[PDB]
Amino acid sequence: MAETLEFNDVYQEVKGSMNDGRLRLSRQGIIFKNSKTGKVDNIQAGELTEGIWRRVALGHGLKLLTKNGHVYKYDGFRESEFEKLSDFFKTHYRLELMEKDLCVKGWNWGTVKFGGQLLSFDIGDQPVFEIPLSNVSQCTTGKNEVTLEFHQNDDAEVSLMEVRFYVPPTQEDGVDPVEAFAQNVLSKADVICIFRELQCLTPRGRYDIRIYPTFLHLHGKTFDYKIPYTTVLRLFLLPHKDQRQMFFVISLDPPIKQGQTRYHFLILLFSKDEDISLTLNMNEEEVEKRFEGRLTKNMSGSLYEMVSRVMKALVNRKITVPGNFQGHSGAQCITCSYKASSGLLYPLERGFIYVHKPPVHIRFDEISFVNFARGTTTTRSFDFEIETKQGTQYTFSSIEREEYGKLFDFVNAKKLNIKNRGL
Amino acid sequence: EQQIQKARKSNVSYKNPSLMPKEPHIREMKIYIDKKYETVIMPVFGIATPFHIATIKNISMSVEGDYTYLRINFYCPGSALGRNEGNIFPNPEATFVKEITYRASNIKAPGEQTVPALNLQNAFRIIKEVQKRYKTREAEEKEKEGIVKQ
Amino acid sequence: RYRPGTVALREIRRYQKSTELLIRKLPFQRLVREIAQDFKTDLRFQSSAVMALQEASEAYLVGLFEDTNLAAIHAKRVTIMPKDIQLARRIRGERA
DNA sequence: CTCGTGCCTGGTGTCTTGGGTGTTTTCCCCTTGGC
DNA sequence: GCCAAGGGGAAAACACCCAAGACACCAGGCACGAG
């Protein structure tokens, strides 16, 4: 065998990225000239503990474990080259290319083993895959869930940026496996904020808002979306007629493309008593710097008031609120129907908005004319007609005689053109 | 008189590491789908790792400024919602890969045969295809069993 | 099955020729006093008046739930949602 | 004195919206025609 | 030849039905409360 063996098709995995290199096995150790960095990585036989031969992206790879706790993965070896590699391996490293087979059964259940830096996830004793823990750049915990976010190593290819593990609570031991597991990961890891459990009416579901510097990553139970703050046309705070909830609206332009369907709005529903606590993973100087002392790095209080303030900053849009419109029933909106559904029509101080699906907004400037037709509740009830300057017509049906006068007083106060005003 | 019995099988992608494919995407650090084996092959931190489509619950994708994020959600405790089969898994106390999220830039990088995001966009699309086909063949067996040959 | 839970609850359906008030009398009586107080002070409430209100309201709310169930059923829904109460009230025209 | 009210958990099941039909209506392409 | 009117075709806007799934409700259980 040669005293050293050289190859050019092998690679090495580091911090969420694979890296090719000119591997040079020697009597002294493995010397690898990484071509992405040009660096020569030399690991001596004395630093090593184990060698493994198994599948990777470019076919098969060589896994090397050091006494240092650092665990190195190598790729690009063809499974057919085994003899050339292992013969030299056994001769100088007194080690062999062991069969720690990847579990190709394709299951998601397994076992997590902290084999130093290389965390192994194994179906029984066959690792499905293993991650060098040093690759974790940010980390968070939730009930029965471990979040691993790798370094945003933009120099990588199709890169596994996030992996999450679901950890069933242990039956034999009362100690929390998430904290225990989370700290064990963190004992090798390399680690803005999340408004957790947000009740969205649009899109429908419960999402966790992972705030980011220029966008909010609305993390969901299957889908997720990032909304660049630049796209928000407006922010609205609409008090629910129940006097117990509030609808927070975010006009989106562009609309998020929910599969084929698209939303020109983001609608949130929160109760007036739905308190929460928020922590910014930012320095207080930065918090003061961006928020003029109107807020603090740590706060607690009603989610609606708090969220309205937090997002008002990230997007700068002012919180839009209804004018002095408060119906005969006192609500700042009117019971109505638009299309094949019912929702709330809000007489804003400078426009009209139909709350909940299909969500629609109107500005007094877009109105051509409107009218209070003889409605559907009583012979003196009303239905409200709207036609836009765009020729697009909207009409809100079925509204009590009681709300006729208030909207009658309101539109005259907004001085908009009513079809029957010439009567 | 007496009660009724049932049986179940495991979702094995490949019998051994040698039977698993060697398709170009795998080499190319690309998320791949092996339709013949109802299996998705993905580069898990440089490791070509298979996942039988039967483990994937559903998928999602997001464009995050300069990047395209493909998110793969898998069946696991608490995620396998609605089914009375809570803890579907042959070993529910095992830890589970809840989900996998890959990102690739929306912009074609130098020398590529396909945009980084193009692999995600095709894997995303093809997963829904193979998944629905599998769900459908599965649904057949549920509706098919319990019928007397006329 | 002769065991408890079976016998009493089973037979209670037949023992229940009684017309037990479904809202707790004192918890309710306090609310009566409270709303009464909300209206005016010095209001002595005869237990008879408290009963009169309690029984009427329970049947009345059950009545409201009859309509609400219909309306849920109407919408092809089992779970009633406040919109049903509202629908029912609107249709009954029993609104302030 | 102890039954009733309540905080907490898991599950469902059941309400929501996405995907889709085909009906009532408009804007557009195609072509002939009149000054 | 330049300039214009008409029938028709493909499509859009709507009221409605069918499918999926997630949350939010009841069911289950241990504990505090005040009838």
Side-chain angles (χ1 to χ4, degrees):
Chain A
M1 304 188 203
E3 301 216 301
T4 180
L5 292 174
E6 180 186 330
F7 314 90
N8 289 279
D9 296 349
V10 292
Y11 297 65
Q12 175 197 53
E13 190 260 295
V14 183
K15 288 195 160 191
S17 74
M18 182 59 77
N19 315 261
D20 87 80
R22 178 178 179 232
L23 187 70
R24 287 164 289 153
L25 306 183
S26 78
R27 299 171 63 187
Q28 296 188 350
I30 294 94
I31 301 99
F32 176 82
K33 161 255 165 188
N34 180 309
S35 306
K36 283 193 172 180
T37 62
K39 187 173 185 283
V40 184
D41 290 336
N42 178 1
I43 296 95
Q44 299 286 283
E47 306 179 52
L48 295 165
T49 60
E50 169 169 39
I52 277 160
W53 173 254
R54 69 187 187 190
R55 192 174 300 297
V56 257
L58 295 131
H60 255 248
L62 174 60
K63 154 177 173 178
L64 304 182
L65 296 77
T66 65
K67 293 174 182 171
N68 327 342
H70 314 163
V71 179
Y72 305 97
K73 292 173 185 171
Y74 302 89
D75 188 8
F77 306 73
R78 294 176 180 80
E79 188 165 21
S80 45
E81 311 321 284
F82 187 12
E83 314 308 339
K84 307 173 185 177
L85 305 166
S86 192
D87 280 350
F88 187 107
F89 216 75
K90 192 169 188 161
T91 302
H92 298 297
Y93 311 142
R94 311 181 186 276
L95 217 91
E96 293 168 300
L97 261 57
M98 303 315 299
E99 294 185 323
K100 195 177 182 176
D101 298 338
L102 295 163
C103 200
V104 298
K105 294 186 182 182
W107 306 342
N108 281 63
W109 46 102
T111 62
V112 175
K113 307 173 194 161
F114 295 81
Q117 265 295 347
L118 186 51
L119 185 84
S120 83
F121 181 94
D122 311 8
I123 280 160
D125 285 323
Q126 300 193 357
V128 193
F129 65 87
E130 317 184 337
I131 316 180
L133 290 161
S134 59
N135 297 6
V136 176
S137 198
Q138 179 165 238
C139 184
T140 53
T141 55
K143 183 173 177 179
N144 303 12
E145 282 187 43
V146 180
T147 305
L148 296 79
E149 294 185 353
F150 302 89
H151 295 289
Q152 194 187 301
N153 193 339
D154 300 321
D155 306 330
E157 298 74 14
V158 189
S159 301
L160 181 41
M161 305 315 300
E162 182 182 334
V163 179
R164 304 177 76 101
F165 290 96
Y166 176 97
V167 180
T170 43
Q171 298 191 346
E172 301 182 327
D173 185 359
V175 173
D176 179 16
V178 172
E179 176 182 326
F181 188 124
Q183 289 173 0
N184 202 342
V185 161
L186 289 165
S187 76
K188 289 98 192 171
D190 212 32
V191 174
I192 292 176
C193 69
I194 307 183
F195 267 123
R196 290 182 174 190
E197 272 294 336
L198 304 189
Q199 177 155 0
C200 303
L201 301 188
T202 312
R204 188 192 70 96
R206 283 168 167 281
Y207 291 80
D208 297 327
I209 277 180
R210 319 188 202 175
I211 296 299
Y212 272 93
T214 58
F215 54 75
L216 62 94
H217 176 191
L218 190 66
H219 174 83
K221 311 196 182 180
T222 280
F223 304 100
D224 329 80
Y225 335 83
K226 275 185 179 171
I227 300 181
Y229 305 148
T230 55
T231 68
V232 178
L233 299 187
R234 294 187 182 210
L235 293 182
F236 327 69
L237 169 62
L238 311 177
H240 194 307
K241 61 173 180 177
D242 70 15
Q243 322 300 1
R244 293 175 182 279
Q245 300 183 101
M246 312 296 289
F247 300 86
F248 198 73
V249 182
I250 311 186
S251 177
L252 305 180
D253 183 7
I256 56 168
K257 299 183 179 178
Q258 183 94 324
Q260 311 185 30
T261 300
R262 311 186 174 86
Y263 313 120
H264 313 288
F265 302 80
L266 208 81
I267 301 195
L268 316 180
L269 173 63
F270 305 132
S271 174
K272 286 173 56 182
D273 313 334
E274 189 162 13
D275 294 322
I276 201 163
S277 187
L278 192 73
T279 295
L280 302 180
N281 195 23
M282 285 174 57
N283 281 39
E284 294 188 51
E285 312 86 84
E286 299 172 326
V287 172
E288 173 58 32
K289 167 185 175 178
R290 289 185 183 169
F291 323 131
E292 308 186 332
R294 300 177 188 282
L295 305 176
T296 51
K297 174 182 167 67
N298 289 297
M299 293 179 289
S300 302
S302 62
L303 176 68
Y304 91 91
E305 186 216 323
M306 199 64 59
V307 172
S308 77
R309 288 168 68 173
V310 173
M311 306 317 299
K312 176 183 184 179
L314 288 159
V315 201
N316 191 48
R317 322 304 194 238
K318 293 186 179 183
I319 297 162
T320 314
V321 299
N324 288 303
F325 179 84
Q326 298 195 3
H328 188 84
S329 53
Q332 311 204 348
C333 49
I334 298 175
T335 300
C336 77
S337 305
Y338 178 65
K339 295 293 192 179
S341 286
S342 178
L344 307 182
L345 177 75
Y346 276 80
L348 300 172
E349 193 170 59
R350 291 175 66 172
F352 289 115
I353 184 175
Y354 175 86
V355 165
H356 190 224
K357 212 176 79 82
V360 170
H361 177 39
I362 313 92
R363 291 173 287 149
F364 300 152
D365 316 329
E366 296 163 334
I367 288 176
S368 177
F369 85 100
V370 308
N371 194 41
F372 309 135
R374 207 168 194 113
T376 54
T377 329
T378 68
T379 62
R380 295 179 183 266
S381 69
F382 77 94
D383 293 28
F384 190 44
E385 315 185 319
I386 302 185
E387 187 176 314
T388 66
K389 290 171 179 178
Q390 304 191 322
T392 289
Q393 191 181 22
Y394 298 144
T395 297
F396 302 92
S397 79
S398 319
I399 315 164
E400 279 77 354
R401 162 178 161 78
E402 280 56 48
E403 306 301 355
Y404 184 78
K406 296 300 188 182
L407 187 57
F408 173 87
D409 286 347
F410 178 92
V411 182
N412 278 282
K414 300 311 182 181
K415 303 178 182 177
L416 314 182
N417 292 309
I418 300 155
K419 182 178 171 182
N420 286 5
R421 205 168 188 265
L423 187 62
Chain B
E1 300 182 23
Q2 298 195 10
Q3 306 185 13
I4 296 161
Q5 301 73 28
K6 296 182 181 177
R8 197 166 186 145
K9 301 172 185 176
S10 59
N11 301 303
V12 172
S13 279
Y14 305 103
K15 293 182 178 181
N16 67 38
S18 70
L19 282 166
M20 180 177 171
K22 311 184 189 183
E23 313 327 298
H25 299 69
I26 305 170
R27 320 171 198 171
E28 292 161 38
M29 307 293 165
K30 288 176 184 169
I31 299 167
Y32 177 72
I33 300 88
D34 180 2
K35 309 194 182 180
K36 184 174 180 177
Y37 286 81
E38 310 167 310
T39 291
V40 181
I41 301 177
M42 65 189 66
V44 178
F45 297 108
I47 304 161
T49 310
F51 282 101
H52 191 289
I53 194 64
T55 63
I56 289 172
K57 175 182 172 184
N58 55 31
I59 72 179
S60 65
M61 186 169 61
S62 46
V63 177
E64 310 205 354
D66 303 337
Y67 294 84
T68 287
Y69 280 61
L70 165 61
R71 171 178 188 209
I72 300 170
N73 313 311
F74 304 93
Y75 300 113
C76 74
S79 76
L81 300 164
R83 283 194 178 221
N84 291 92
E85 307 177 9
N87 302 301
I88 298 180
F89 334 107
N91 181 356
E93 304 310 317
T95 291
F96 286 81
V97 169
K98 189 189 181 190
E99 57 166 281
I100 274 172
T101 296
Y102 277 98
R103 89 179 169 146
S105 184
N106 307 337
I107 296 156
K108 186 180 175 183
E112 291 193 300
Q113 296 186 5
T114 59
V115 177
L118 182 63
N119 169 238
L120 298 189
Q121 290 163 357
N122 275 326
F124 171 88
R125 181 178 61 77
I126 295 163
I127 284 169
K128 283 197 173 194
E129 178 208 324
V130 179
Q131 196 194 35
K132 210 78 179 190
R133 196 163 192 171
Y134 174 74
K135 271 193 164 188
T136 301
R137 184 165 53 258
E138 182 188 28
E140 275 192 325
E141 296 178 356
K142 178 176 287 184
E143 301 287 58
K144 183 72 61 64
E145 194 54 86
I147 283 178
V148 174
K149 178 182 175 183
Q150 302 304 290
Chain C
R1 191 183 188 215
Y2 326 109
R3 293 215 73 247
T6 305
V7 173
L9 288 168
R10 182 183 67 217
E11 297 179 6
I12 274 164
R13 298 189 82 160
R14 100 219 208 108
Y15 306 158
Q16 193 251 310
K17 294 183 179 176
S18 57
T19 46
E20 61 272 27
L21 276 48
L22 300 180
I23 303 166
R24 302 209 109 286
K25 69 184 191 288
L26 178 59
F28 181 88
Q29 179 168 14
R30 294 161 180 165
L31 181 60
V32 171
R33 287 170 176 168
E34 172 182 308
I35 301 169
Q37 190 74 352
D38 293 345
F39 273 71
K40 293 188 175 185
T41 62
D42 318 76
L43 293 181
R44 265 184 161 272
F45 234 94
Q46 287 183 342
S47 58
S48 58
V50 182
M51 313 328 297
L53 293 172
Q54 186 162 356
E55 294 180 43
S57 64
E58 287 179 8
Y60 158 74
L61 291 180
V62 166
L64 181 67
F65 285 118
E66 297 199 300
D67 302 349
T68 309
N69 186 24
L70 288 179
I73 276 167
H74 193 62
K76 306 180 182 177
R77 277 187 286 100
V78 314
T79 304
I80 49 159
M81 289 132 190
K83 48 182 175 185
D84 300 313
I85 288 183
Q86 291 152 29
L87 174 66
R89 288 193 69 210
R90 202 171 198 198
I91 290 177
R92 287 197 181 195
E94 292 181 12
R95 293 184 171 209

